[PDB]
Amino acid sequence: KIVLDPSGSMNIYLVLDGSGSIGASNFTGAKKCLVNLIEKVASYGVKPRYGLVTYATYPKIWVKVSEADSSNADWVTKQLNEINYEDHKLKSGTNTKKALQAVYSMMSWPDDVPPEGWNRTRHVIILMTDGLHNMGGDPITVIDEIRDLLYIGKDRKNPREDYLDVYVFGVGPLVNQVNINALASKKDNEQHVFKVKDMENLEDVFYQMIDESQSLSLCGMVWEHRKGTDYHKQPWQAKISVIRPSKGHESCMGAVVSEYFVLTAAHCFTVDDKEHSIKVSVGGEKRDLEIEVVLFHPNYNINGKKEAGIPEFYDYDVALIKLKNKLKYGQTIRPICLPCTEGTTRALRLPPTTTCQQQKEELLPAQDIKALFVSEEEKKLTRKEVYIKNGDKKGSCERDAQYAPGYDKVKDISEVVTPRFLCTGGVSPYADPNTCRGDAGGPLIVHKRSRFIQVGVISWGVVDVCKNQKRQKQVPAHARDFHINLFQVLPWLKEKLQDEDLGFL
Amino acid sequence: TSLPTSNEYQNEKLANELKSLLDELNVNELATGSLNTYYKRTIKISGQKAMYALKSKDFKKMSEAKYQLQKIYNEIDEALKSKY
Amino acid sequence: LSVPYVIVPLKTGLQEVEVKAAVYHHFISDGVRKSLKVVPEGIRMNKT
Amino acid sequence: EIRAVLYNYRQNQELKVRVELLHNPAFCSLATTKRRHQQTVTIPPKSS
Amino acid sequence: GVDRYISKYELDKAFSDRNTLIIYLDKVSHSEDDCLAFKVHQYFNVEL
Amino acid sequence: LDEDIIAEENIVSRSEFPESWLWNVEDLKEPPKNGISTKLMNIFLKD
Ligand SMILES: *[C@@H]1O[C@H](CO)[C@@H](O[C@@H]2O[C@H](CO)[C@@H](O)[C@H](O)[C@H]2NC(C)=O)[C@H](O)[C@H]1NC(C)=O
Ligand SMILES: *[C@@H]1O[C@H](CO)[C@@H](O[C@@H]2O[C@H](CO)[C@@H](O)[C@H](O)[C@H]2NC(C)=O)[C@H](O)[C@H]1NC(C)=O
């Protein structure tokens, strides 16, 4: 497999066949597969040394692991994308043995003294070919020299089997399984052989080889493989149900933020709601998790202007729930990243000296921002893509609040719509779905650099298009939804969650 | 036009069911790569049965392969959840 | 039913033997991969 | 109205069945000697 | 609907085998008619 | 191949043939029903 450790030092050798047995369209699919892989690797925050080699009759080395540029993901992606199938088409042999000898030269140290960290270093080789090596000698004998040189499998006391992993991708229309199965590494319950049909559905391919041993707790990281369920697609997604006599059953959403804490709206609960009447289910288990206490925001007040004439006041509609027992992160249980944290800095691939304001600028520009929230359809979680109206139409998004039932004759718009609210919904630039009342409390999700950051919490909507418990049939276009900005309540979260050790800047 | 006859519609419904499982077959065969050798042995055996059943259009083999491929799919689903 | 085969060992050690079988008109198959010891000629002696 | 129940207790095989009510000169239905009252139905496994 | 229920085992059958339907009503008024309706579609294409 | 038989390559061989296995230890800490703990262990069989 492959271990993802932030303290790691790993060499990744990319060998790409360029013989006529491949074809241009399949060679491009080979490139698109590598580009997605390199991007997904950089999402974990690990910096390996990349080696890029294309070979036919003679190997051509593009990136050597000795260069400092080998640790640049974007630069290697640029080098790979520029490579063309007909770049060395006129030398269209298949001499894999020489290409492996070049890799052997890369890991080979000068003279007889290996640099320190040779056994500390992990080595990974990825080969793509048709299994029809026609030029040069046997390629397997170079593998034995690599096994010997790295002292792998040569000692019972220290096997070193986990320091080398070999994957082979069967590309091109015609392909030979026999030689490919011989080239690939063979380990118990580890996939190292891939066929032509495996080139589709890439997320499942990487799911088999990646081992998240030292990367379990990273925030905002999703498994998108086809077999995955709702919670593979939303690890932070938490379903919160409140059932209490007289009040009855009610359901809201929540987002995992730490081992003990889930973030959700405040208006879903009340001070009268007892902790035993609140049930939260993260991973989808039917075993409901017990809670300890609900931390309402100090400045929250639903009846702040009730005597003035306002029915409900949703300012600072956030709450932190502390679980009775701490969660154990996994493939279906992971937190969502929070703004102005070192984790968000590493998620956005920013230097450690990046400020909270610089992160604020990137997340919330004065424009329409692509985002999404979570909704339920027939007891199944589904994604709804929306736009945050932060540009010039931000005023028009706030103005549509006048059509909300119960606030039609309220004179002052700035009183009810506080700067905490982020405004979505509408038909411009594109149609944004409107939330059900059960969808309230969920996070407002933005996607950047193959990761997911939370920027808001679902608050309330102008028009309840999902009144009859169904969001069926068309609705007027001015139905807007409002969400609580995280930057406004950032001091309260930093104060409360500083004991969870999330690395606030 | 005239509506389809007795068995033509029924045979199509069964085929659509088999086609659906076959679309995720390559994914499931891949998913067993990190699982125990029991699954890898079981699914590749159950895979061809469905593949031959579709191109042969044999009702007997298409029915069995459907439930045979459905069972190993459920075994993989439980295996991945308990493996975490 | 027993199906005999004839083979010759070529190298010493716990070497590998694999056989497969498949039936027609049903997709039921089985395969057996076992290993047995290839021993060079000779015998044990416990001299003092 | 009469109800005919057909049981299939195979564990992995659904059955396409030709079922027919035959004519009787003492009872009236679509079943006559000329015109048979036949249907083709499918029973899921372990179901009726 | 209130005073109305259909079992899930009956509900999830859909077009494949729903020919006999079972609808449960918790009560029916005695003063005037209580009604309901639904569409039907032919999918077998047989006359008579 | 188009014939009505499983191809050889996809035939996967049984190879795990140890005589003895399941050398495990477990503690009965499950909720006692009439003082008797009910433990469930999902185990892989061998070939
Ligand atoms: C990398 O290589 C050495 C090989 O010498 C590995 O073995 C260790 O060697 C040092 C000094 O010779 C011993 O103190 C350790 O106990 C060895 N490790 C064992 C036996 O597991 C070692 O993995 C690495 N050396 C380091 C990290 O100094
Ligand atoms: C490599 O070759 C092509 C390149 O995309 C793809 O395979 C199919 O090739 C046939 C004829 O060569 C085309 O008619 C299809 O449109 C291709 N795509 C399919 C079937 O999805 C594919 O990417 C690779 N594999 C093979 C076997 O050709």
Side-chain angles (χ1 to χ4, degrees):
Chain A
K1 302 180 72 174
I2 173 180
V3 288
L4 282 306
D5 63 317
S7 62
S9 59
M10 188 155 56
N11 293 10
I12 309 178
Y13 301 97
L14 305 179
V15 189
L16 173 57
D17 193 358
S19 62
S21 36
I22 304 304
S25 179
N26 313 89
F27 150 82
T28 300
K31 293 207 302 178
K32 292 293 298 298
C33 181
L34 288 177
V35 174
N36 293 265
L37 181 57
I38 298 174
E39 167 64 12
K40 193 174 178 68
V41 167
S43 68
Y44 282 76
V46 182
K47 283 178 57 181
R49 308 187 189 99
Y50 282 111
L52 189 57
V53 174
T54 58
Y55 79 100
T57 304
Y58 299 112
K60 175 54 198 303
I61 308 179
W62 304 88
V63 181
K64 302 178 179 178
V65 296
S66 59
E67 300 179 293
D69 309 318
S70 63
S71 64
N72 192 337
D74 300 337
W75 182 82
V76 171
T77 306
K78 183 177 181 183
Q79 305 319 289
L80 171 61
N81 190 28
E82 179 171 298
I83 297 178
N84 182 22
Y85 182 57
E86 304 180 306
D87 192 8
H88 52 75
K89 179 183 175 181
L90 302 86
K91 313 174 186 175
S92 52
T94 309
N95 182 19
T96 314
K97 186 261 180 179
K98 190 65 178 183
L100 301 179
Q101 185 175 343
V103 176
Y104 171 81
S105 301
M106 293 299 162
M107 60 181 66
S108 179
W109 49 80
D111 294 336
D112 304 325
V113 277
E116 192 165 81
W118 51 274
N119 57 340
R120 161 73 180 79
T121 305
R122 303 288 180 172
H123 287 272
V124 177
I125 307 177
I126 300 181
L127 173 63
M128 316 181 80
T129 182
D130 66 335
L132 299 177
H133 62 281
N134 43 44
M135 298 288 301
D138 175 54
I140 306 293
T141 181
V142 189
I143 305 296
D144 290 335
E145 293 186 299
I146 291 184
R147 294 267 304 281
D148 168 67
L149 197 275
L150 302 180
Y151 198 71
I152 297 178
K154 304 304 189 75
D155 192 3
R156 177 179 170 179
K157 188 172 176 182
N158 190 228
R160 294 181 53 75
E161 294 190 42
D162 300 322
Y163 295 93
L164 177 62
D165 297 73
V166 178
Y167 304 98
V168 182
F169 287 83
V171 296
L174 290 316
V175 63
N176 177 25
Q177 284 298 127
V178 179
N179 182 235
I180 278 184
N181 299 338
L183 291 160
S185 185
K186 193 183 187 184
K187 295 180 185 180
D188 294 341
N189 309 327
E190 298 184 19
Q191 189 61 269
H192 292 266
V193 178
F194 310 106
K195 59 198 299 179
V196 184
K197 193 63 176 181
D198 296 331
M199 301 303 297
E200 300 190 313
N201 311 274
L202 294 173
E203 278 278 320
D204 307 77
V205 173
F206 309 145
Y207 179 68
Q208 306 313 127
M209 48 171 61
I210 290 182
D211 184 17
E212 312 179 89
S213 186
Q214 310 310 123
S215 303
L216 296 165
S217 61
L218 269 59
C219 62
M221 190 166 294
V222 175
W223 278 113
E224 294 278 63
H225 73 118
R226 182 174 299 272
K227 286 258 73 179
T229 56
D230 307 11
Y231 310 102
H232 286 91
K233 297 175 174 292
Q234 287 81 231
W236 56 85
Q237 184 58 39
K239 184 174 178 63
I240 308 175
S241 299
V242 176
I243 304 94
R244 191 162 59 90
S246 182
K247 179 174 177 177
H249 58 271
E250 184 57 275
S251 180
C252 286
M253 291 185 173
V256 180
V257 292
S258 191
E259 293 171 302
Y260 279 103
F261 284 94
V262 177
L263 175 60
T264 183
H267 83 273
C268 288
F269 322 111
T270 182
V271 185
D272 300 337
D273 290 334
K274 280 301 112 297
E275 296 82 298
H276 68 264
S277 68
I278 306 176
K279 305 297 184 183
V280 179
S281 183
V282 185
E285 293 178 306
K286 302 177 180 179
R287 182 180 182 177
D288 297 329
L289 308 176
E290 292 180 78
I291 71 175
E292 182 177 292
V293 70
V294 180
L295 304 179
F296 297 93
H297 190 265
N299 299 111
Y300 167 68
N301 192 349
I302 185 179
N303 296 314
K305 294 82 176 295
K306 189 62 153 288
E307 294 183 298
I310 302 179
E312 299 177 42
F313 200 63
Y314 302 134
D315 196 11
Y316 296 99
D317 191 17
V318 290
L320 291 173
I321 310 174
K322 183 184 177 180
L323 297 171
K324 185 179 179 67
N325 298 313
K326 71 170 188 176
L327 292 170
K328 289 83 178 179
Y329 301 117
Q331 276 56 43
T332 64
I333 301 174
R334 272 173 174 163
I336 188 169
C337 306
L338 303 178
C340 294
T341 56
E342 288 186 47
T344 305
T345 296
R346 295 177 182 104
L348 299 182
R349 311 180 190 185
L350 304 173
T353 54
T354 308
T355 64
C356 178
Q357 181 57 224
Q358 290 170 293
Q359 299 189 190
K360 178 180 180 181
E361 175 184 49
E362 175 60 37
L363 292 173
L364 303 178
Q367 63 179 80
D368 300 324
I369 316 174
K370 297 177 160 60
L372 65 158
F373 68 93
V374 188
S375 179
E376 287 187 42
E377 291 188 20
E378 295 185 315
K379 298 182 179 179
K380 182 182 181 184
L381 297 176
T382 177
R383 301 181 180 171
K384 308 292 187 180
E385 178 176 69
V386 293
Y387 286 93
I388 297 182
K389 314 305 180 301
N390 197 30
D392 56 350
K393 296 180 299 300
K394 181 180 186 179
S396 299
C397 199
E398 301 173 20
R399 279 189 289 261
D400 288 352
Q402 188 175 34
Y403 304 115
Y407 311 87
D408 311 73
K409 295 182 179 181
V410 180
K411 296 182 66 175
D412 193 6
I413 175 66
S414 186
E415 171 62 67
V416 286
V417 180
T418 60
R420 267 67 66 181
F421 286 115
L422 297 177
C423 196
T424 63
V427 298
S428 183
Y430 299 100
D432 295 339
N434 292 92
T435 62
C436 295
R437 257 52 189 174
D439 309 333
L444 190 57
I445 310 171
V446 174
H447 185 70
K448 287 287 184 66
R449 281 290 195 172
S450 291
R451 301 286 288 275
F452 295 86
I453 318 282
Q454 182 183 7
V455 300
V457 176
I458 305 174
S459 181
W460 68 287
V462 172
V463 182
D464 189 10
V465 306
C466 185
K467 186 174 182 178
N468 198 251
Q469 105 174 75
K470 304 185 297 178
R471 48 167 68 254
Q472 201 173 25
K473 295 182 69 176
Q474 294 182 100
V475 294
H478 61 81
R480 311 290 184 161
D481 291 3
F482 289 97
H483 317 260
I484 308 300
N485 185 12
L486 294 190
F487 287 98
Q488 293 288 287
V489 296
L490 180 61
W492 171 68
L493 298 168
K494 184 176 175 183
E495 171 66 60
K496 287 304 180 181
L497 307 181
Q498 62 178 74
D499 306 326
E500 295 295 303
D501 192 10
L502 301 182
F504 288 96
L505 300 180
Chain B
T1 66
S2 57
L3 299 177
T5 47
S6 57
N7 295 274
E8 183 82 34
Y9 180 72
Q10 314 323 118
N11 191 90
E12 175 174 75
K13 173 60 182 179
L14 177 61
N16 297 339
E17 296 177 318
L18 188 61
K19 169 66 172 175
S20 303
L21 301 176
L22 284 168
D23 291 334
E24 61 170 297
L25 173 64
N26 188 90
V27 183
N28 291 264
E29 177 181 330
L30 177 67
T32 61
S34 60
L35 297 183
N36 191 14
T37 60
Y38 154 75
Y39 305 105
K40 179 180 184 183
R41 167 161 47 93
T42 308
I43 184 174
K44 296 180 65 175
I45 290 180
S46 187
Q48 299 160 106
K49 181 188 299 186
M51 292 194 289
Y52 189 97
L54 186 69
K55 64 107 180 186
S56 63
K57 297 297 187 304
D58 189 4
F59 184 91
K60 171 181 171 61
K61 293 182 177 179
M62 291 188 296
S63 171
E64 158 172 330
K66 168 181 57 169
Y67 300 113
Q68 281 295 339
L69 196 57
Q70 176 62 86
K71 182 179 301 179
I72 179 58
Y73 281 179
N74 301 329
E75 285 189 56
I76 297 171
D77 294 334
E78 294 298 319
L80 296 175
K81 289 188 300 180
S82 59
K83 174 61 67 175
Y84 303 117
Chain C
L1 188 55
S2 171
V3 179
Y5 287 103
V6 289
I7 55 176
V8 170
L10 304 184
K11 57 185 299 180
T12 55
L14 181 58
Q15 304 307 138
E16 169 180 284
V17 174
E18 183 175 47
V19 292
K20 295 184 180 187
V23 313
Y24 279 84
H25 306 301
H26 285 94
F27 290 94
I28 313 169
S29 63
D30 190 21
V32 174
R33 177 170 72 236
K34 289 182 181 182
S35 299
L36 80 169
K37 298 181 182 183
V38 179
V39 177
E41 52 173 87
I43 196 181
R44 300 285 168 84
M45 262 72 167
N46 51 354
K47 306 173 182 179
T48 298
Chain D
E1 175 205 62
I2 57 176
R3 299 287 273 274
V5 193
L6 300 86
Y7 298 87
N8 171 28
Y9 286 101
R10 298 296 289 186
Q11 12 75 46
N12 57 334
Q13 180 90 110
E14 66 186 26
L15 300 177
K16 162 171 57 181
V17 184
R18 172 192 179 271
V19 49
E20 177 174 339
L21 158 66
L22 276 72
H23 177 54
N24 193 328
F27 297 87
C28 218
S29 66
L30 297 179
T32 53
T33 43
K34 291 182 180 180
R35 170 199 306 158
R36 296 171 174 267
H37 193 357
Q38 52 181 20
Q39 289 71 47
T40 310
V41 297
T42 301
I43 310 177
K46 303 182 67 175
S47 70
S48 65
Chain E
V2 69
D3 301 322
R4 302 185 176 187
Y5 172 68
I6 292 183
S7 53
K8 168 178 167 56
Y9 181 84
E10 169 62 43
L11 194 60
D12 50 15
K13 282 183 159 297
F15 306 106
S16 64
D17 54 321
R18 173 175 290 115
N19 54 341
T20 61
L21 177 58
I22 312 185
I23 296 182
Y24 315 103
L25 297 182
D26 297 15
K27 62 186 295 292
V28 287
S29 184
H30 82 138
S31 302
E32 30 72 44
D33 300 1
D34 295 329
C35 303
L36 55 87
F38 54 92
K39 299 165 56 183
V40 295
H41 305 290
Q42 193 186 357
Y43 68 95
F44 212 76
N45 210 16
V46 56
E47 56 183 293
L48 303 176
Chain F
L1 100 159
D2 204 18
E3 294 185 55
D4 196 2
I5 192 171
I6 294 179
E8 174 270 302
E9 297 92 281
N10 292 328
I11 302 176
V12 185
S13 306
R14 305 175 286 107
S15 55
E16 284 195 74
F17 303 113
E19 318 90 58
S20 54
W21 55 287
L22 201 55
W23 185 266
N24 292 92
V25 183
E26 269 285 299
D27 298 334
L28 287 164
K29 305 258 68 179
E30 289 76 8
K33 303 175 63 179
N34 304 122
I36 309 302
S37 292
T38 304
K39 177 185 298 298
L40 300 174
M41 288 187 64
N42 191 258
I43 53 181
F44 287 94
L45 289 171
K46 298 306 179 183
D47 297 339

